Write a protein that binds this DNA or RNA. Structure first.
Lengths: 68, 177, 377, 367
RNA sequence: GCCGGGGUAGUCUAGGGGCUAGGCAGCGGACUGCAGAUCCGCCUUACGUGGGUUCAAAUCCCACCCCCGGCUCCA
């Protein structure tokens, strides 16, 4: 995957919105787990769930620019 | 890749901040290209570059929770010439025993004349220019690689590319970053 | 599971709006768009106070001196906007009952702040009303003398540097020179100028300058700047007696949180964009020259030396009276094409600005309006 | 203009996320994620949602009317300016916030202090002493314009029975302003139960909003003088200067409001955190100042053991700041060892333990 | 936290955009065992970290971290 392959396309606004909302939701962990930010298994699953779902929204965005 | 497979680990906050900043930068496109948000080829490259660099940072975060990512690909035998040593440094941390050299600027000197400002600062650069062109040898001379790539991070590097392999063959860019 | 006594989920209709789905043409909005540098700063500084410890690093001290040089004034103080800056000088310089002499194009907050400072107000009139509505700056002398001859005192001279109805620029130096030899303090309302075009306070011989962060310095509301000469420092920065450090007109406030952070963050972007003020005028004049072709008459001084445009738009009346949407039609036709910022129901006039827009967005807006008035007979 | 702009390009480095902040003034201003999303929607700008919000605040505080402000101190000055005649006396407690004195002086009013039921170590206010101070002033011919109680002070974090002062003010015919900074948004508040005529609140101190915002709640009785309008612009309220509240602080305030309504119902849990910190730190020789037990999260400690360490450490009094910094804890003033103030409001219980164990390990390793 | 000094390879000290710093109880090899000179490489990615400027940064810019001195007892 290279950005140089990017093709003309439309930005899916809502899909972008969902992506950044998820990182906002994940931002909580940076507060609640400060200062050492060490997560346990339950916290890890809850947190990474947010990160991964963000990446799926980002991929859908990249889909509209010729990426698959 | 499933979240259920996530394992105990530490959040890299600096990696998380780089990720969220990249989306914040990308948010400008939702303003500047409103209402239709249609992007042309150059805008698409610039925008997707942000999204993709963000997804990479997210992947480094996920790596701390057991998830694994296959880390580009690099031939560790080849020699890699580079102008910056920020690029040099970056190469040596992604892979330490990986062998690279720093020319510290443009190499040839009417190559240097191609960028500008005259000029017996140049034959003042007499040693330097060739000091890069000496030292490149001191690496190639004894390890001497199969083939020798030159990494390109902007257009003035490809000029260094041309001179380097007037002399010794092979090009690269971005594919290992 | 809500704690029901009253509705609470109507509050998460805040969660998604239409802020990125539209071009906003509202002139009070154009100069307050946040650059990415400031948005990043917001992410770092959401929460409550931002006080690591009023001489702060968080470089507020350094920012206040830099914003002073930028305006070529002796001193500066952070405010909750241009409103508060006016009220502060009206409250700490004038004595109650004094007269404030201001132009007839003055922003309503100049009137309201005067009433709050229990001051009287006299208006300097037009050099010409319709259609330019240009202020007679020389008329400041006659009003003052008119008032001094009647035993009334004039505590403050005020000039709206660019009014918010027509967007007319004014030669501040002239009112400054009148104020100098007539020995009356001069406040230049640089809401709508500071952060768009360059402004030299000393050259216009201004004693005070108020700036609006959210209007014209790409910052979040509410913030602003009050700049002033060393001569009036003692009264502006007058301290509480029980608390020797806290300044009374500030309410001692560590002028707090998010807006001042965005103001410091947007500052380099602002400094660079006033050097390019001519490019925004070019966008502005392109709009005026182009919409006149379909029957929009630019009001105010021609040509525009500011981005705020007020058009007389008879053709929009002509269409409103024949369409079922009946005056809402223009607002609905704009939203349908992803444009807002114009008041619904109004067709006799419109106010707009394309300040800060990309040139592609400028063309889009212009073509949009043309196709509206074309398609709608 | 020959100035280096590089200083403003990396403000991207406030350390709220990599440090635990124990500073009381900031504990209740931490944004929930619902507010952060709202900020993303309104970085720049967007009023019926505001008017409905004010109606809700009025009910939530059980008051007739409410108006948005740039903070608690602005709310104070608004009342003093619109209600009191110049020269009047405001009567307030000796634990009053400096902004109360300053707002009074700005409204060119006079100030009389109600004193202490007891000083060391609780520094409690003699609330019935309000009748005395009022009497003594009225007997001297001075008129009292305003009665002011700081519901919870910002020095010791004492809670005060506002209803007692309310009844006093009711039977001497004097308007009562309750300074509910440090209180509204933390604990439930019933304004008319305490018979308050006015309530000020700090959005950014105790209502999980971005600075600067606040609330001024008032009775229908004084609505005409508070919401009085300009003669030239009858729609515009003079004391508000026409505002027209826009920008992020009022957005965060509204977006955080359901979270705030929720968290006052769980105020006891935060007290439980607070009392846990007191009991534990007293074992290492800290002494809690103020009324006991805590009925607010703001703790002031007398810390003799810290000061004794300071006299033998090369870093002197700043040793404690460093040691906390090494373990990711801040919000306590540098160099001060005779006293410290702190709150663990809103922290996770795990973070509360971490703070306590860190402090214990400080004093033990540093003798 | 504030004001100064500082951080350069196993540590020692220079240099203030480009001249590939140089000296050791540090370790191998250049006959053997004792003692001194050279070639070397050696942990090699030398410049506390992350950004920025530049064709090029130890060097200039911003921010942050650690070591040494010092100074403060609430608004």
């Amino acid at each position: 995957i290279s950005y140089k392959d990017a093709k003309p396309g439309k930005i899916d606004v809502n899909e972008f919105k969902k992506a950044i909302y998820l990182l906002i939701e994940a931002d909580d962990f940076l507060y609640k787990k400060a200062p050492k930010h060490e997560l346990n298994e339950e916290e890890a699953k809850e947190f990474c769930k947010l990160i991964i779902k963000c990446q799926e929204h980002l991929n859908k965005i990249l889909a509209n620019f010729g990426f698959e | 890749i499933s979240y259920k497979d996530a394992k105990p680990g530490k959040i890299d906050v600096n990696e998380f901040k780089k990720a969220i900043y990249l989306l914040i930068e990308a948010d400008d496109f939702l303003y500047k290209k409103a209402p239709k948000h249609e992007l042309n080829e150059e805008e698409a490259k610039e925008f997707c570059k942000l999204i993709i660099k963000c997804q990479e940072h997210l992947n480094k975060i996920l790596a701390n929770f057991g998830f694994e990512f296959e880390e580009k690909e690099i031939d560790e035998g080849a020699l890699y010439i580079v102008s910056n040593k920020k690029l040099f440094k970056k190469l040596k941390n992604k892979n330490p025993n990986l062998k690279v050299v720093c020319t510290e600027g443009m190499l040839d000197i009417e190559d240097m004349r191609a960028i500008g400002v005259p000029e017996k600062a140049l034959e003042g650069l007499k040693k330097k220019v060739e000091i890069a062109r000496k030292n490149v040898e001191r690496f190639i001379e004894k390890y001497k690689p199969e083939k020798i790539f030159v990494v390109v991070e902007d257009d003035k590097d490809e000029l260094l590319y041309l001179r380097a392999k007037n002399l010794y063959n092979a090009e690269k860019l971005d594919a290992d970053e | 599971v809500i704690t029901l006594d009253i509705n609470l989920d109507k509050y998460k209709n805040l969660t998604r709006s239409l802020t990125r789905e539209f071009i906003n043409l509202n002139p009070i909005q154009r100069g307050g768009i946040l650059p990415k540098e400031a948005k990043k700063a917001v992410y770092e500084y959401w929460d409550g106070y931002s006080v690591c410890d009023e001489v702060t690093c968080p470089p507020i001290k350094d920012f206040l001196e830099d914003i002073a040089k930028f305006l070529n004034m002796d001193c500066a103080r952070p405010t909750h906007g241009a409103r508060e800056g006016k009220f502060i000088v009206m409250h700490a310089i004038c004595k109650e009952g004094d007269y404030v002499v201001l132009d007839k194009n003055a922003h309503y907050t100049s009137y309201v702040a005067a009433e709050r400072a229990k001051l009287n107000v006299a208006e300097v009139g037009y050099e010409e009303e319709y259609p330019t509505y240009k202020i007679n700056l020389e008329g400041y002398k006659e009003v003052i003398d008119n008032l001094e001859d009647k035993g009334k005192n004039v505590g403050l001279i005020l000039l709206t540097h660019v009014d918010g109805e027509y967007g007319n620029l004014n030669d501040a130096k002239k009112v400054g020179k009148i104020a100098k030899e007539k020995g009356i303090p001069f406040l230049l309302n640089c809401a709508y100028t500071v952060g768009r075009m360059p402004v030299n306070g000393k050259e216009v011989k201004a004693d005070f300058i108020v700036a609006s962060g959210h209007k014209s310095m790409a910052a979040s509301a509410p913030c602003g700047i009050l700049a002033f000469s060393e001569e009036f420092s003692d009264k502006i920065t007058k301290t509480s007696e029980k608390f020797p450090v806290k300044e009374i007109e500030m309410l001692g406030c560590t002028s707090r949180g998010l807006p001042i952070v965005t103001l410091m963050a947007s500052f380099p972007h602002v400094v660079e964009r006033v050097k390019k003020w001519d490019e925004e005028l070019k966008k502005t004049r392109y709009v005026v020259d182009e919409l006149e072709k379909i029957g929009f008459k630019q009001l105010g001084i021609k040509p525009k030396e500011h981005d705020l445009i007020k058009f007389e738009t008879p053709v929009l009346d002509e269409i409103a009276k024949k369409d079922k949407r009946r005056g809402f039609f223009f607002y609905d036709e704009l939203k349908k094409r992803g444009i807002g910022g114009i008041r619904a129901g109004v067709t006799k006039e419109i106010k707009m600005s394309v300040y800060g827009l990309e040139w592609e967005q400028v063309e889009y807006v212009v073509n949009a309006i043309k196709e509206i008035v074309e398609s709608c007979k």
